[PDB]
Each structure stands twice: as C-alpha cells, then as structure tokens.
Design a protein around this motif. Sequence first.
Motif, PDB file in Angstrom:
ATOM      1  N   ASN A  51      -0.281  14.020   0.088  1.00  0.00           N
ATOM      2  CA  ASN A  51      -1.448  15.251  -0.219  1.00  0.00           C
ATOM      3  C   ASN A  51      -1.131  15.801   1.284  1.00  0.00           C
ATOM      4  N   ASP A  72      -2.806  -1.704 -12.977  1.00  0.00           N
ATOM      5  CA  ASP A  72      -3.066  -0.415 -13.426  1.00  0.00           C
ATOM      6  C   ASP A  72      -2.251  -0.121 -14.306  1.00  0.00           C
ATOM      7  N   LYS A 121       0.008  11.626  -9.882  1.00  0.00           N
ATOM      8  CA  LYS A 121      -0.296  12.398  -8.858  1.00  0.00           C
ATOM      9  C   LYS A 121       0.721  13.231  -9.079  1.00  0.00           C
ATOM     10  N   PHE A 176       1.557   4.480 -10.567  1.00  0.00           N
ATOM     11  CA  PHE A 176       0.227   5.758  -9.730  1.00  0.00           C
ATOM     12  C   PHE A 176       0.838   7.062  -9.219  1.00  0.00           C
ATOM     13  N   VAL A 184       1.449   8.981  -1.756  1.00  0.00           N
ATOM     14  CA  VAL A 184       0.511   9.924  -2.635  1.00  0.00           C
ATOM     15  C   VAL A 184      -0.518  10.533  -0.939  1.00  0.00           C
ATOM     16  N   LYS A 185      -1.166   9.831   0.080  1.00  0.00           N
ATOM     17  CA  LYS A 185      -1.563  10.146   0.581  1.00  0.00           C
ATOM     18  C   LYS A 185      -0.644  11.440   1.850  1.00  0.00           C
ATOM     19  N   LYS A 240       1.031  -1.006  -0.403  1.00  0.00           N
ATOM     20  CA  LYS A 240       0.028  -0.253  -0.123  1.00  0.00           C
ATOM     21  C   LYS A 240       1.059   1.488   0.114  1.00  0.00           C
ATOM     22  N   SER A 241       1.991   0.961  -0.215  1.00  0.00           N
ATOM     23  CA  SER A 241       3.017   2.251  -0.584  1.00  0.00           C
ATOM     24  C   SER A 241       2.647   3.210  -1.011  1.00  0.00           C
ATOM     25  N   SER A 242       1.973   3.151  -2.534  1.00  0.00           N
ATOM     26  CA  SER A 242       1.403   3.759  -3.931  1.00  0.00           C
ATOM     27  C   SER A 242       0.582   4.705  -3.305  1.00  0.00           C
ATOM     28  N   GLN A 243      -0.711   4.013  -1.978  1.00  0.00           N
ATOM     29  CA  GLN A 243      -1.499   4.990  -1.686  1.00  0.00           C
ATOM     30  C   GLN A 243      -0.989   5.820  -0.311  1.00  0.00           C
ATOM     31  N   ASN A 244      -0.534   4.875   0.541  1.00  0.00           N
ATOM     32  CA  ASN A 244      -0.255   6.148   2.029  1.00  0.00           C
ATOM     33  C   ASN A 244       1.085   7.264   1.138  1.00  0.00           C
ATOM     34  N   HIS A 290       2.677   0.365  -8.918  1.00  0.00           N
ATOM     35  CA  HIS A 290       3.163   1.348  -7.690  1.00  0.00           C
ATOM     36  C   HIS A 290       3.512   2.616  -8.445  1.00  0.00           C
TER      37      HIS A 290
END
Length: 673
Positions: free
Chosen positions: A376, A550, A448, A444, A372-373, A366-370, A441
């Motif tokens: 942000n 993706d 961003k 993604f 970008v989080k 979940k590194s990509s998510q985290n 990853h």
Amino acid sequence: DDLLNINDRIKQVQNERNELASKLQNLKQSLASNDTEVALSEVIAQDIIEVGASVEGLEQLRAKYGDLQILNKLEKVAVQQTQMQAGVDKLDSFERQLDELAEQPPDQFTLDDVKALHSKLTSVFATVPQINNIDSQYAAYNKLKSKVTGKYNDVIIQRLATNWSNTFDQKLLEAQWDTQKFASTSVGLVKCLRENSTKLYQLSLLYLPLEEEPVLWNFKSLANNFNVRFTYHFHATSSSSKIETYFQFLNDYLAENLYKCINIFHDDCNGLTKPVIHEQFINYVLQPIRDKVRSTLFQNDLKTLIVLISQILATDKNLLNSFHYHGLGLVSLISDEVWEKWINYEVEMANRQFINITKNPEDFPKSSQNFVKLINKIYDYLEPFYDLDFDLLVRYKLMTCSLIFMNLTSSYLDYILTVDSLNETRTKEQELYQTMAKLQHVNFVYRKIKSLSSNFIFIQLTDIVNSTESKKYNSLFQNVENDYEKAMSTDMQNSIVHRIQKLLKETLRNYFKISTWSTLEMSPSSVPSAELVNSINVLRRLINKLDSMDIPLAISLKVKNELLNVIVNYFTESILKLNKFNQNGLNQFLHDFKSLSSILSLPSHATNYKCMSLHELVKILKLKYDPNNQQFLNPEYIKTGNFTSLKEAYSIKYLKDTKIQDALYRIIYGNIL
C-alpha cells in the motif's frame, strides 16, 4: 619501362571490353524480362541503353516507338531521380547562401528577409516528391536536407531571435509593464509593445522542424521581467521547502499579471489568441522555475531526488487546478535520465523495505499484513505519478509495475516457499500449522493482488500493453497470479495433506493391532474402538486449525476430500483386508470409520466415490448374515463374473466388479466368521 605500363593498359582494355560486353548483355536480358508487354526489339533496346537515364531522352523514345509500358516504368523512375538530384543541387546552392548570411549581422535583417528565406527553403523541399524506396539515393538527399535545415534554424532563426528578443526585453524592463508603474494610458506604448511581441512571435514560427514544439521568443521576453525578479530574489540554491515559495510568488505574480498580459498583447488576427497567451505566458513564466529546480536537483542527493520528484508532481497538480493550465507543468523539467535514476532508486527502496519485514523468523506471523501494508505505502507514494497524463513517461509506469509490485509480490511467494520460523527443534504438528499458516499468508496477498488489478490505473496500463504488442492479457498481474494459484493449489495443498497423513498414521499404531475384530459380540449405546480415540482427537484438532485459516474454499475442500480417500484406503487395506470379522465387529468397523471420517466435516449428503464404495463393500460382506439372498454365495456364481443380480439387489452403484468378486471370495474362504 613505360612499355610495361602500356603492356598492362592493353590487358586492361581487353578485360574492360569483356566486362562492358557481358554487362551490356545481362542488361539487355533484364529489359526483356521486365517487359511483360513484349514490345521491345533490339534496336529500341539499344536506344534505351543510349539515352535512357534522362527524362528528355525517354520522351523522344516515345515520340518514336509510341507509348511503351516499359518506357514508362523507366521514365517514372527517371523523373524521380532528375528531381531528387535537382533537389540536392538547390539545397547546396542554399547552404552556400546561408553560410554567407551567417556574416551579415542580425540587425540588417527584416521579418520579411527571413520570411523570404523560409519560403525559398520550403519551395526547395516541395521540388522533391516523397518516395518510399528503402534507402534510395534518397538517404543522401535526406542527410543534406536535415543539415541545411539545421543551419537555417541556427544561423537564421536562432541568432535573429536571441538578438531581437534581447532588444525586446529591454523595452519590457523600461516599460515595467508587469507593475502598477505601467503607463497603460499611453496607448501608444501598448501598440509598440504587442507589435514587437507579434514581430517576434511570427519570426518564431518560421522555424522548420527536422524530419524524424518551437520556441516562442516573444514569450521568452514577456516572462523575462518575471525571470529577472525571480532569479534575483531566489539567489540561494533551491530547497525542498523552497519550491513552495516559488509557486507562491508565481501565483501572486500571475494572479496580478496573467490578465494584464492577455489584454496587452492579444493580436488575434495574427495568431495571438487570448487562450494562447493565457496558456503560453504561464508556460514561459514557469521556465525560470523549471531551471532553479532542475539545477538544484542533480546537484543534490538521491534521497532528495525521491522527495523533489513527488513535490514536483504534487506542486504541479496544484497549478493544474489553480489557473487551469493545460500546458507543460514543471513535470517536463525532470529529464528522461533523471526519471531512470528514480525508478532505480525506487526499486532499491522497495527491496530494502521488503527485507526489513521478512529478515527474521519473528517477522513471519504478520508478514502478509506487513507485506500488503508495504505494497500500500508504495502505491500511495506512486499515486501522484500515474496521475500524470502525458504518455512520454508511460514507459516508467510499466516499469514501476514489473520491477516493484510484480517483483515484490513473487519475491514474497518465494519468501513463503523458503522460510522456517520454527525453533531448531520442533514437532510434526508445529510444522503442519506453519504450512497452514503459509497457505493463509499466500491467500491473503493473493487477494490483494487480485484487488490491485481492479485499479483503473492498471486496467488501462494493461490495455496499452495489449494494443502495443498485439497481445490479450487479462492483467499485468496474470503471471504472478498464476504463480500464487499453483503454489496454493498443488505445492501447499499437497503438503498439508501429506503432513496430516503422516501425523494420522502415527496415531493409528495401536488401532492397527486390534485383534478383537473376530471375537467381539456387540451386546445399545455403542462407542468407537478405544484405541481410535487419540486419532479422533488429533484429527479433530488438526482440522479445527484448518477451518480457522482463511484459505480458499476450493482448497479447504480438496484437502478434506483427499484426506477422506486416504482414511478410506487405510480402513480398506490396513484393517479390513488383514483381519477376520464377525457380524458385531463388522459394524464396529463402520462405526469406527464413520466416527473418524466425520471429523473432516465435509458437506453432508455430498458424494465421495471411495467412501461410498467402502460402505457398499462392507454390505456385500454381510451377505453371510442375509438368508433371503444367501444364494450369491455359491462358488459357481462367483467365478461366473457376472454380478447384475447382486448389484440390483444391494443397490451397488460404485464397487467395481473385480472388487465385488474378491468380496464374496473373502466370505466363502471364511475370512468372515
């Protein structure tokens, strides 16, 4: 004894004579050269050398030898020096006058007395004409000018101003004008009051700024009552929760006095416009606050620094809209050095967090998510900053980019290119999926960034950077955007391809051993070679994983295409070339080939060079089973090397002539039973 001295002075004179001699020669040669007009003689040249540094001299040398274009080129230079030297003489005579007035006590001066001094000093400055001769005798004059200007503002403007300002805020305390206890009906006061603010305001304007804004003492006094009250009431240190209490007292104070002031002290004829007072008053009433905050700031934690800055920003925008004040907010209280400490502490904060979401293998999925989080969160935080408009802190806005977003981003690409979340022990397939996961990853986080580059804030910061150093970047993200692009386009894409090829090769072990190719007789619902079934399962499996990732479309296609070529090479070299085929087996081949390669699922009726060439090749080999054209199978035609009859007959558009010949030969020599 002394004759030793005399013996030496003689030698000296004999030398000094020579020097002055040849120096005078080299000079005469220079007046010649710098005389394009060619109007100089010897006698004149000499006269120039006698009286040629004085303006009065050159002038008489014109009364005589007319208007020489070389005398001018000297007199301009002459007058430019005679004044610059006249300047330094005047300044010095002024430094002295100041030095002595530094004794006369501040009460014995009048608005006029000051006014005079100011006129006289600007009058001196006007004597000297501004010339741009790099470090002329100018640098000297300049240092002196600056020095006397300094003394003038200190010993005259500041002393006097502090003094009258004090005397003026005493009357403002007694008159308690910023309270209902104010005798507004007196009218006699109101006049004495603004007459005093003006007298002080004008003295303030007699400040002369140093070359290479001014304090408005009249306003210092007006804000003093607010100041006395403010300092007393907020005795204890300034707290985070306290800054809000400040502006509260401020709002209330202003909302009740802002206009009392605007009306009491506006003196338009003298420069004191209502917009001014409305503007300045707030500016100076903010000072006592700027100091409490400023104070409590550096005498406090780094963790608090980050908090106290956002709060300052927040609280400042709040005032921007409240009384629509365009002047300096508290923003200015934050020192240039305090800012530098911020970005540092802000950078260290980004790197701290980055780690927390990438320090273990468990974090990878979940590194990509985290990430970008995290990107942000950091931008939301910097939103208030960025919002600010005065360009002074635009240097920190560019830093914010490079040392935070840009570092963090490429720092992530690095994390991805050097990680392994798999167990000590692993399977080739798990490794392939990890690679594919990494591509997903990277793509993604790549989006961003691309998105982030369409943020007005950065579109402009870029324009700035672009004009500032005459360069034309497309964005400040352009480099890290290329880093990602390449990583995806070569590094990973090839890795995916090579790994799959590795997996595929393993499963073809038995398919490579088939011997049937020359003895089978396809007796019709055909099925692919039994030993090719596992290969089809694995590849079907691997590609399903790819189509679920993706990944950018261009890469998904390059991978699939490259694989197709690889598969084609395999069938051509490892199967076709090393085995004997017979009608039935030759179709089993194409069936097997198609059965496997159709899994890549490339766009239909989309041409792949290698793939087409393979079909064409299997066709020319069937020439052994084509009676209508079994003409092309005569040794004489093969060796001829010209295949235009065959090409046209079998519509061969890809197979190169060299490969077509070997094809035939393969038939003739009986490799095709």
